[PDB]
């Protein structure tokens, strides 16, 4: 790997610089290098990894959606034939996106998840696994589409089970996991009722636990609770 010669601490330092410079591809490459050193990641380091790849894949997803929309319009009645270029370029972006997802899933499988024993790390990584299978599912159209969806579901479900047992209902990782699994239900699994039920239950159980929190913890939990509310408003 190209980062093999750089110190772990230097990779982390440069990931933080890349973030400040909004150089998310660089940030992701630095954090991949850090993971490949073989040591477990701290809370801060896990969040550098997630932020980096979230931004990279987020840009790819936005581009893919633009191109998919153009492609869909090209296949409507009355649309003039413009040749293979739209499909080709959508496929190019799609392949790049799948590559990033596969890279992230590869890091999780080799060997972040298996060494993650604490709830906060294990749930975090399983949430990531669910998310990146979800992104693969967004672009899947073939024989393995059902299996990709089930891979996302399975990762989310394991994360949910651990989070319910080991974390308070206001824990931000627990809340974010539930937010995203709810979106999985609505957007991927064709299960809007499950999505709504999960968002509502999550919100209500968090509300009941807010009284236990400091001001700073309250702030962070309520931010994610508002996102649950926003989705519920969108869906009802």
């Amino acid at each position: 790997g190209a980062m093999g010669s750089m110190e772990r601490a230097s990779l982390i330092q440069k990931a933080k610089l890349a973030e400040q410079a909004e150089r998310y591809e660089d940030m992701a490459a630095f954090m991949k290098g850090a993971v490949e050193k073989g040591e477990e990641l701290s809370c801060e380091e896990r969040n550098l990894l997630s932020v980096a790849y979230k931004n990279v894949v987020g840009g790819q997803r936005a581009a893919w959606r633009v191109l998919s929309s153009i492609e869909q319009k090209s296949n409507e009645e009355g649309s003039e034939e413009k040749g293979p270029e739209v499909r080709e370029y959508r496929e190019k972006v799609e392949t790049e996106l799948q590559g990033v997802c596969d890279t992230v899933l590869g890091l999780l499988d080799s060997h972040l998840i298996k060494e993650a024993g604490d709830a906060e790390s294990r749930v975090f990584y399983l949430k990531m696994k669910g998310d990146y299978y979800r992104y693969l599912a967004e672009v899947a159209t073939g024989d393995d589409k059902k299996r990709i969806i089930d891979s996302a579901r399975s990762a989310y479900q394991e994360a949910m089970d651990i989070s319910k047992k080991e974390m308070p209902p206001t824990n931000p990782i627990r809340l974010g996991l539930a937010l995203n699994f709810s979106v999985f239900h609505y957007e991927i699994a064709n299960s809007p009722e499950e999505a709504i039920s999960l968002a509502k239950t999550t919100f209500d159980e968090a509300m009941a636990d807010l009284h236990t929190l400091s001001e700073d913890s309250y702030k962070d939990s309520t931010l994610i609770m508002q996102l649950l509310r926003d989705n519920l408003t969108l869906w009802t």
Partner: peptide, 5 residues
């Protein structure tokens, strides 16, 4: 699109 984190 719905919110995710």
């Amino acid at each position: 699109f719905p919110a995710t984190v």
